[PDB]
Amino acid sequence: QLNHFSDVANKAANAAGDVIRKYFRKNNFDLSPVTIADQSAEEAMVSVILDNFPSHAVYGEEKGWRCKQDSADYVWVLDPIDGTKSFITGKPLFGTLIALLQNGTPILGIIDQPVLKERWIGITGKRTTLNGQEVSTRTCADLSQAYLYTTSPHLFSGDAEEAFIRVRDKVKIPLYGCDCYAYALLSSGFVDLVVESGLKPYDFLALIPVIEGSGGVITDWKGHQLRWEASPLSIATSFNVVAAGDKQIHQQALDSLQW
């Protein structure tokens, strides 16, 4: 069953990537391609998921929870295009995110960059892979040595901005720009810390098996389990995320955030 879930997840990603490639870089003139692409890619992923698993649920931004039954043990939580600003501006560092949750816990995550043809797959029980090769996070001696990413300086509001700044000022260097891709880099051992505020569950659940299966750590800003039980009544509110390659760095970050 678990290899069947992986095979179907890969089929979904293959379909989404062809759709997305059709619309990327079409907008260089003075519904938009990104909206069509998101919708069409989601439909292509859902269609193959539900053909293979009619008892499963799906969850996406626009349509919410959908299931032919009142309830489901298995829920696919999808974002065809995480990083729509990158997509719209022609930058190939957006990703397609696919998570499969069993009783609310992610058991499979994919980060797919269809232009670069890079696919990270996290599966509970397995080491994370990139294009079929195992990857690992790296150690990092101290927060002062850590390479930090976040999408944008402007995506922190209120007290979260002050907390971010506390961590930001302590790392080796803060870098910006690319949504889920930074977490993929962390999982491959090229980034030490990612700290973001205001992620919806379809933009973080796929990250969890990827990072954890690479040896990293990902929690909310209090260090609690990042969790969202997709259900008919779950609310897609936004969460604060901190991911690290090294658990000691993670703790240092938590101590600076003071959330």
Ligand X SMILES: N[C@H](CO)Cc1c[nH]c[nH+]1
Is residue 188 close enough to count as binding a second copy by CB under 8 A? yes
Smallest distance, a second copy to C-beta of residue 52, A: 33
Residue 53 contact partner, candidates Cl ion, ligand X, a second copy, none, CB within 5 to 8 A by sort of partner: Cl ion
Smallest distance, ligand X to C-beta of residue 178, A: 8
String marking each residue 38-67 x if it binds Cl ion according to CB under 5 A: ---------------xxx------------
Is residue 48 close enough to count as binding ligand X by CB under 6 A? no
**What is the rounded CA–CA span in Å between residue 203 and residue 100?**
13
Helix (H, G, I), strand (E, B) or coil at 149: strand
**What is the rounded CA–CA span in Å between residue 250 and residue 23?**
38
Asked whether the beta carbons of 99 and 12 are under 8 A apart, the reply is no
In Å, how far are 177, 185, 206 from 198, measured between CA atoms?
A: 15, 20, 16
Q: Which of 165, 198, 227, 231 binds ligand X (CB under 6 A)?
A: 198
Smallest distance, ligand X to C-beta of residue 86, A: 9
Asked whether the beta carbons of 101 and 77 are under 8 A apart, the reply is yes
176, β-bridge pairs: 150
Asked whether the beta carbons of 206 and 109 are under 8 A apart, the reply is yes
Residue 187 contact partner, candidates ligand X, a second copy, Cl ion, none, CB within 5 to 8 A by sort of partner: none
Rg (CA), the chain: 18
Within 10 A of 154 (CB to CB), how many other CB atoms are there?
8
Give, as ranges, the residues between 158 and 187 that touch ligand X (CB under 6 A): 179-180
**What is the rounded CA–CA span in Å between residue 82 and residue 85?**
9
Using CB under 6 A, list all residues that contact ligand X: 82-83, 151, 155, 179-180, 196-199, 203
Using CB under 8 A, list all residues that contact a second copy: 25, 27-30, 85-86, 88-93, 115-116, 135-136, 138-140, 147, 149, 152-154, 173-178, 181, 185, 188-191, 246
Using CB under 5 A, list all residues that contact Cl ion: 53-55
- Annotated binding-site positions for Mg(2+): 61, 79, 81-82, 203
